[PDB]
Scaffold this active site. Structure first.
Site, PDB file in Angstrom:
ATOM      1  N   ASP B 374       7.807  -0.610  21.854  1.00 36.16           N
ATOM      2  CA  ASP B 374       7.640  -0.876  23.222  1.00 36.16           C
ATOM      3  C   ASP B 374       6.700   0.278  23.646  1.00 36.16           C
ATOM      4  O   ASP B 374       6.939   1.581  23.277  1.00 36.16           O
ATOM      5  CB  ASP B 374       8.832  -0.861  24.140  1.00 36.16           C
ATOM      6  CG  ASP B 374       8.606  -1.407  25.678  1.00 36.16           C
ATOM      7  OD1 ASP B 374       7.893  -2.656  25.743  1.00 36.16           O
ATOM      8  OD2 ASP B 374       9.116  -0.456  26.455  1.00 36.16           O
ATOM      9  N   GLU B 449       3.021  -2.365  20.457  1.00 36.94           N
ATOM     10  CA  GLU B 449       2.525  -2.820  21.878  1.00 36.94           C
ATOM     11  C   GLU B 449       1.386  -1.820  22.231  1.00 36.94           C
ATOM     12  O   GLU B 449       2.359  -0.878  23.135  1.00 36.94           O
ATOM     13  CB  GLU B 449       3.799  -3.066  22.690  1.00 36.94           C
ATOM     14  CG  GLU B 449       3.403  -3.712  24.282  1.00 36.94           C
ATOM     15  CD  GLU B 449       4.504  -3.857  24.995  1.00 36.94           C
ATOM     16  OE1 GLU B 449       5.158  -2.887  25.399  1.00 36.94           O
ATOM     17  OE2 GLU B 449       4.800  -4.980  25.519  1.00 36.94           O
TER      18      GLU B 449
END
Ligand SMILES: *[C@@H]1O[C@H](CO)[C@@H](O[C@H]2O[C@H](CO)[C@@H](O[C@H]3O[C@H](CO)[C@@H](O[C@H]4O[C@H](CO)[C@@H](O[C@H]5O[C@H](CO)[C@@H](O[C@H]6O[C@H](CO)[C@@H](O[C@H]7O[C@H](CO)[C@@H](O)[C@H](O)[C@H]7O)[C@H](O)[C@H]6O)[C@H](O)[C@H]5O)[C@H](O)[C@H]4O)[C@H](O)[C@H]3O)[C@H](O)[C@H]2O)[C@H](O)[C@H]1O
Ligand SMILES: *[C@@H]1O[C@H](CO)[C@@H](O[C@H]2O[C@H](CO)[C@@H](O[C@H]3O[C@H](CO)[C@@H](O[C@H]4O[C@H](CO)[C@@H](O[C@H]5O[C@H](CO)[C@@H](O[C@H]6O[C@H](CO)[C@@H](O[C@H]7O[C@H](CO)[C@@H](O)[C@H](O)[C@H]7O)[C@H](O)[C@H]6O)[C@H](O)[C@H]5O)[C@H](O)[C@H]4O)[C@H](O)[C@H]3O)[C@H](O)[C@H]2O)[C@H](O)[C@H]1O
Ligand SMILES: OC[C@H]1O[C@H](O[C@H]2[C@H](O)[C@@H](O)[C@@H](O[C@H]3[C@H](O)[C@@H](O)[C@@H](O)O[C@@H]3CO)O[C@@H]2CO)[C@H](O)[C@@H](O)[C@@H]1O
Ligand SMILES: OC[C@H]1O[C@H](O[C@H]2[C@H](O)[C@@H](O)[C@@H](O[C@H]3[C@H](O)[C@@H](O)[C@@H](O)O[C@@H]3CO)O[C@@H]2CO)[C@H](O)[C@@H](O)[C@@H]1O
Ligand SMILES: OC[C@H]1O[C@H](O[C@H]2[C@H](O)[C@@H](O)[C@@H](O[C@H]3[C@H](O)[C@@H](O)[C@@H](O)O[C@@H]3CO)O[C@@H]2CO)[C@H](O)[C@@H](O)[C@@H]1O
Ligand SMILES: OC[C@H]1O[C@H](O)[C@H](O)[C@@H](O)[C@@H]1O
Lengths: 801, 792
Positions: B374, B449
């Protein structure tokens, strides 16, 4: 005076002494109270008439069994010779030996062709016997030499059969003509021999009436309700007998457009005659066939050839008319030359009152005795043309001999041109031909259908204006053929506009009544016949026994008639055909694909048009004559129904055709007696209501209402390119696929049958639901579609089952 | 032998021993069987080990407290004590005393609070509340001696090591080639919480096991789990004005403990079993995935923690060593690149080692196959450094230091100790390097990401260390969404590139004029990667559902934030409608997007629900909702009203069965060709609405694929391959099941043959009609002239 009084001729081993007899009826008839056989025959010009009698054995050896010469004072009233014979033996057959003047023997009497060396046939003969079996040569005799009857081996002596006895009559079992409304008909054009002559028919009696009965079921299942039989009257198939060079095959007169006798069924189509039955066997065998047709919902229409006969011109054989009264029966010039409007040798003198009566009687005979439903008149224009008249022969007061006359007795103008006695020059096409009037108005024939091939070999064309006496005649519409062939193959010029007219039943021909600027018939004699008719006046056809086969229209640019022996000069010169990319059988996939589409596209034009469609035997499965467009003379598989190729149905074309016939029949909108208007039909293009009528058009498309809120969308894309059609939106409704010649069979016709279930059809409709909901339909080059309006159902776009 | 450290025995353990600093965490001494406890704090003055019975934990009270001797029970900045013969049913934490910046401004960034008992970062299992959504006890929090913060944040404790190891039965991670993956992004609770799931333990690791066959039948070979590391679903516990319903932290992007599996996804823990029971429940899950050839990829959240900023709870790092664990400015302010409150101090060495230890743990203990990082950009940024604490040699008391001991520049800006400004994104971050190079992790997949909330975006050039990293490809998403709705611009061209595995983003060495990262820190990363670097998606747990991006122009997040530029089109009306043309068009567009996704080079990811047309009613950020918005609707999957699930299922299998789409190298012009309405005549203009291509199979065959995104239908002239014809397979314009012509329970092989023959005249003509907003796939086959004879 009295008919019962003996006339002087002695009894024999086979009849009682002859009696005077009676003029009426013409022909041989049973006298009702005595049981005897009255004979009556017309001749205005004969000096002597003898009744000639034959056993079959004697017939076959060219000799008479008995002769009875009629007394010119007793056995004759006016121009009708007559005699009666009691106790006449049933195994005997009859003719007449007629003596009188002949023009080659005396110049003063042109048109007279009597010959006492011949025995001529009663025009009103119920049955004829000569040769029993198709293609069987006549017996080897010393023809020509003294006392022997018959012209040559291909033309042996024939004879007429006696009337059937009282108590012996056909069991119709309550059969009647069907009188189906004309607009409801689908006509199949068929030849009796060719219907089952091929090994694959599997019938007991190939090429016969009885044989045809064994396979009548196929026609009913095809969806046909009328059969039009090629000439069924006695003819001589050996009249063109000769060898085909490059082969041991021999040519024949196969079709039969060359009639020997008009009152007798063709004996060599009778199974029973081939098995050695008495000559009348053909009569009952034909009756049976008609009964069987009617049981199956099928009307019988006879092709009749009243415009010329088998006797040809002067070089032809003398077998009936010529030797009875040549001046009455044939259309003649003042020298005795034969008019040739038929292009076959002679021209029958149709409007001459004895001949008129002959034809009347003939038609009534077939309707009344054989329960037939209609007639198709070969080269019907000749029935409109004015006859040749001659003055009655004047004999010498004191001498009793024959007096010669100015112009041979021909009734002529001051300039010598021949005339009909009533001031009309012979041949002139009459607006009111009295023969056609009588046909149109005779009560016996009032429910009988009449169809004209309204043209002849002298360039006279009466289509749109045949003397029709109140809508009583339909016509072979050859303009339909020309228009459909042209438009469908993809062609510049007026063919889209003309095609739309064809689709409507050709109102441009049968309702409209402003003539061509240079068409003499339409501007004059035909003027009063030009409107006052409906779409059912039009017999629609794409192909016939004449010309190219449907399959060959798409496989051949040019005719290939070399085997016919007229060196390719015969047959239509302009077929409006296209081979789809290569002449004849091909290995190229692209071309075969295209032909499969084109065959169906042409069939679509035919079965989706107003008026009355006719299908040429074989066209419903892909039949080929290998590019021969005039197979009149071939007793071979070129002219036979290929039951083997029918069964095989290798691209599902027979299924397609069958299904389109049935569908047509379930569609009242296509079967009209009045012409569609703008509420009934609308025209479209790639966009709704935007048809292309230009010279370069390649698309005609229309909606046809059913007057219940529904209807059809039909389209013909004749472009080399594919198209996206935007369909007209009918509120609350969606178009559903039925016909699409783009699709491989069976998906070319989405209807339930042995191949597609109800489930299969629904699935195939749902597949396209996004396209049809969108009102968008893609079409292949040279393709055809038919869609049906259905209430919209949004659930169609969810998963199928 | 560890010397005795002086603390008395009790009923629950023997006299304490000194212990060792390694390994960090609680572990079993192989020599004595004693439990060694080890824990890092460079800032603490006192550390006590606190032990809890479950009863005592529930009541906010400690059972035992063992003060650690700062000399003997500590080595460097690692505090340690050993306790022999310890009752293994106790749980543990730490009371840490030290200075706090509010009690003394001279020490910015120090946030010790001895009223708290904080969690071991290295805890194997956490116990606090046993059942999803269960409120903590109603204690007088904040009063003398009561442990815990508030009812949504009651006192947590960690479980001890077990003295009965799990039976893996020969299980190992699958090590599937990255290019062969089809990934399913899923949430463990959402997977079976819905009543229609019909499982024994809805919403659990055990519940998910019971429905894994669905995923195998779907043709998925990797599952990516939303955060399974312990988190507090009651962090956002609040009533939604509209309804009865309360807001949760449903997704779990706010981690409490990185080494413990989320206890409230364990059926066993919810049933009263010991806290460790979830460890085995999770191992069972991984084992059952692997039996079915499904890999397990964990979404991980190392850029921020659940402690928020200074207004959040002290549960762990803040109370242990705030200065070490968090990115701080020199006044102790919390940097916030996460957009969540704090930013974890990722590149400082103790922190680095923690993250690494964490990844190694989940791989080694739990046989996990990969990680999704993330906001991975945050792990590239330079940390904040503080000088080591100074004490008076005489007094022993703290000495205050210039700037609070923050290591700043002459202009006072915070720094990492080594001259880099705190926050600067590094070309060569040691954490990302260590991850990429550590042998334990060498066959572990890594997915970045590659962006964060301060507008840093690194896609195309994340530090990848020889292609060890793939990235979520956000370009793919935007391009596919724009091309497929029908949109003027460069979309056709960008879509063609998207189909090729985005080589314009991953092999293109020429950076943009304005992009700082690519022209500097990322320059060395701008190439040396294949299409399997691109994780393709059209949707994810974030944003619109597949169904909804075809039904809504604008988001609908009242019940809650969430993307503002969604690139969606509702196909003619917002939300549900009875207009037939809209529904038809949506049905096609769902297929058209999915086709773009599954017919592209790179690696596709599917967002749970998007294979049956799951809707969130237009809400594009459903993080706070424990309801059917985030649950797999087994009922709706079973209904499959327009055969969309069938279509997706088949498309996935067809893709797995097509080597040409699963590549480690980029396609060239021999591999792929670009056509339009005419062969070899593509349209790259700003008004383009068509992209079509041929793709070779290396055997003389291949695929024709085309996306018509126009509002008008088209006729396509296909390219003629000698001796061959294109056969229908996919056509999004056909109603199901004719949208996908392949054998299964609905179509027989007969049905397929016949469907193909129907069109033999069209295909032989090399002509194909396509509807607006539609997509086809054809299959080159040898030419058979007999195709046009009667099907029979
Ligand atoms: C609607 O309408 C039309 C027409 O009704 C249909 O058209 C089709 O059918 C037509 C007729 O079947 C067909 O036409 C073809 O046949 C006709 C003849 O019927 C031809 O017409 C022209 O040519 C003939 C022949 O050249 C002329 O005949 C005249 O001369 C001959 C003498 O050469 C006479 O023949 C007679 O004597 C000979 C010699 O004695 C006999 O032959 C015998 O000896 C031979 C050897 O020396 C042997 O080979 C033979 O086997 C022996 O029998 C012969 O039997 C005997 O008839 C004629 O009597 C005399 O009139 C015509 O004058 C002349 O007009 C056409 O040329 C042919 O095409 C069409 O093609 C079909 O399309 C249509 O189908 C319907 O829809
Ligand atoms: C990858 O990347 C992203 C991010 O990782 C993913 O995005 C998704 O997940 C996101 C994280 O879940 C989500 O973001 C949303 O949540 C974050 C925070 O986690 C928000 O961040 C911003 O706004 C908050 C809220 O204002 C700020 O929090 C700070 O202040 C609050 C308020 O004081 C502190 O809360 C703490 O204090 C109170 C004290 O009482 C506690 O509440 C208690 O009382 C309440 C009533 O008074 C009760 O209702 C409650 O139930 C009680 O417990 C509270 O529990 C306690 O924690 C914070 O600690 C403090 O930091 C943030 O600083 C600020 O950044 C976002 O705005 C939200 O959108 C995204 O929406 C998701 O899309 C993505 O999925 C991945 O791809
Ligand atoms: O293929 C390109 C070409 O196709 C179209 O022309 C075809 C006609 O549609 C088609 O009927 C046929 O034309 C033939 C005539 O019908 C026939 O009477 C005779 O004259 O031969 C013609 C062909 O040799 O075939 C042509 C093409 O083969 C379309 O009209 C053209 O514009 C187009 O270029
Ligand atoms: O609408 C009902 C109408 O249908 C039929 O008329 C169509 C013609 O058959 C068709 O040829 C075409 O007529 C056009 C010519 O072809 C063109 O050259 C030019 O002159 O315009 C004509 C008129 O459009 O279109 C008509 C329909 O408009 C049928 O024949 C009619 O009797 C019937 O009423
Ligand atoms: O053919 C192999 C080739 O395919 C792919 O290249 C295509 C691009 O993806 C695509 O954008 C398009 O590029 C064009 C631009 O859009 C246009 O504005 C202008 O600059 O021309 C470009 C092409 O000339 O088309 C190309 C194909 O030519 C893919 O990128 C590569 O992997 C591969 O080499
Ligand atoms: O006269 C003979 C010809 O007349 C007509 O013009 C017809 O169009 C043609 O088919 C026929 O054979």
């Amino acid at each position: 005076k009295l008919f019962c009084e003996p006339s002087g001729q002695p009894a024999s081993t086979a009849y009682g002494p002859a009696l005077t007899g009676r003029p009426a009826p013409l022909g041989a008839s049973i006298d009702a109270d005595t049981g005897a056989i009255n004979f009556s025959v017309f001749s205005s010009s004969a000096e002597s008439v003898s009744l000639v009698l034959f056993t079959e054995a004697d017939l076959n050896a060219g000799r008479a069994t008995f002769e009875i010469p009629l007394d010119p004072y007793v056995n004759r009233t006016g121009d009708v010779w007559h005699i009666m014979l009691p106790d006449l033996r049933d195994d005997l057959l009859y003719g007449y030996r007629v003596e009188g003047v002949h023009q080659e023997e005396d110049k003063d009497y042109p048109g007279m062709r009597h010959d006492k060396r011949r025995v001529v046939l009663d025009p009103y003969a119920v049955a004829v016997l000569n040769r029993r079996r198709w293609g069987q040569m006549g017996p080897n005799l010393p023809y020509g030499e003294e006392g022997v009857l018959g012209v040559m081996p291909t033309w042996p002596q024939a004879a007429a059969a006696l009337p059937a006895a009282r108590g012996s009559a056909f069991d119709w079992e309550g059969d009647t003509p069907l009188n189906l409304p004309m607009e409801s008909l689908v006509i199949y054009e068929a030849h009796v021999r060719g219907f089952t002559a091929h090994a694959s028919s599997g019938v007991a009696a190939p090429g016969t009436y009885a044989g045809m009965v064994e396979r009548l079921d196929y026609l009913k299942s095809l969806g046909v309700n009328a059969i039009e039989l090629l000439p069924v009257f006695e003819f001589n198939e050996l009249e063109y007998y000769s060898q085909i060079p490059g082969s041991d095959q021999y040519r024949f007169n196969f079709w039969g457009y060359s009639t020997v006798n008009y009152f007798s069924p063709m004996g060599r189509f009778s199974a029973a005659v081939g098995q050695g039955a008495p000559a009348r066997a053909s009569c009952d065998e034909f009756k049976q066939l008609v009964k069987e047709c009617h049981r199956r919902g099928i009307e019988v229409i006879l092709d009749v050839v009243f415009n010329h006969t088998a006797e040809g011109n002067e070089r032809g054989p003398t077998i009936s008319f010529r030797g009875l009264d040549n001046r009455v029966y044939y259309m003649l010039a003042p020298g005795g030359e034969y008019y040739n409007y038929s292009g076959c040798g002679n021209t029958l003198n149709c409007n001459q009152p004895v001949v008129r009566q002959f034809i009347l009687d003939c038609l009534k005979h077939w309707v009344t005795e054989y329960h037939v439903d209609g007639f198709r008149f070969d080269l019907a224009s000749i029935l409109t043309r004015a006859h040749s008249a001659w003055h009655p022969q004047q004999y010498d007061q004191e001498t009793g001999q024959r007096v010669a006359m100015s112009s041979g007795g021909a009734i002529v103008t001051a300039e010598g041109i021949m005339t009909d006695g009533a001031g009309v020059p012979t041949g002139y096409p009459l607006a009111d031909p009295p023969l056609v009037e009588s046909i149109s108005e005779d009560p016996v024939l009032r429910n009988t259908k009449m169809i004209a091939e309204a043209w002849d070999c002298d360039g006279l064309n009466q289509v749109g204006a045949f003397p029709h006496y109140g809508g009583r005649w339909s016509e072979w519409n050859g303009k339909f053929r020309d228009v459909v062939r042209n438009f469908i193959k993809g062609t510049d010029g007026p063919w889209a506009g003309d095609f739309a007219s064809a689709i409507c039943g050709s109102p441009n021909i049968y309702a409209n009544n402003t003539p061509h600027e240079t068409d003499w018939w339409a501007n004059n004699g035909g003027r009063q016949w030009k409107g006052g008719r409906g779409p059912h006046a039009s017999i629609n056809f794409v192909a016939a026994h004449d010309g190219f086969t449907l399959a060959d229209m798409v496989a051949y640019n040019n005719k290939h008639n070399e085997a016919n022996g007229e060196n390719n000069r015969d047959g239509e010169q302009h077929n409006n055909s296209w081979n789809c990319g290569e002449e004849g059988p091909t290995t190229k996939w692209e071309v075969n694909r295209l032909r499969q589409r084109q065959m169906r596209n042409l069939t679509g034009a035919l079965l989706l048009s107003c008026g009355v469609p006719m299908i040429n035997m074989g066209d419903e499965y892909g039949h080929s004559k290998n590019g021969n467009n005039n197979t009149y003379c071939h007793d071979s598989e070129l002219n036979y129904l290929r039951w083997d190729q029918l069964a095989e149905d290798p691209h599902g074309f027979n299924r397609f055709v069958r299904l389109l016939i049935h569908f047509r029949r379930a569609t009242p909108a296509l079967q009209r007696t009045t012409f569609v208007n703008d509420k009934d039909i609308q025209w479209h293009g790639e966009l709704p209501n935007t048809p292309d009528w230009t010279d370069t058009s390649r698309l005609v498309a229309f909606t046809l209402h059913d007057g219940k809120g529904g209807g059809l969308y039909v389209a013909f894309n004749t472009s080399h390119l594919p198209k996206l059609l935007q369909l007209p939106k009918w509120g609350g409704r969606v178009w559903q696929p039925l016909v699409d010649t783009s699709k491989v069979a069976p998906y070319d016709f989405l209807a339930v049958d042995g191949v597609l279930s109800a489930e299969d059809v629904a699935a195939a409709r749902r597949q396209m639901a996004m396209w049809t909901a969108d009102h968008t339909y893609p079409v292949l080059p040279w393709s055809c579609i038919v869609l049906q309006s259905a209430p919209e159902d949004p659930a169609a776009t969810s998963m199928i089952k």
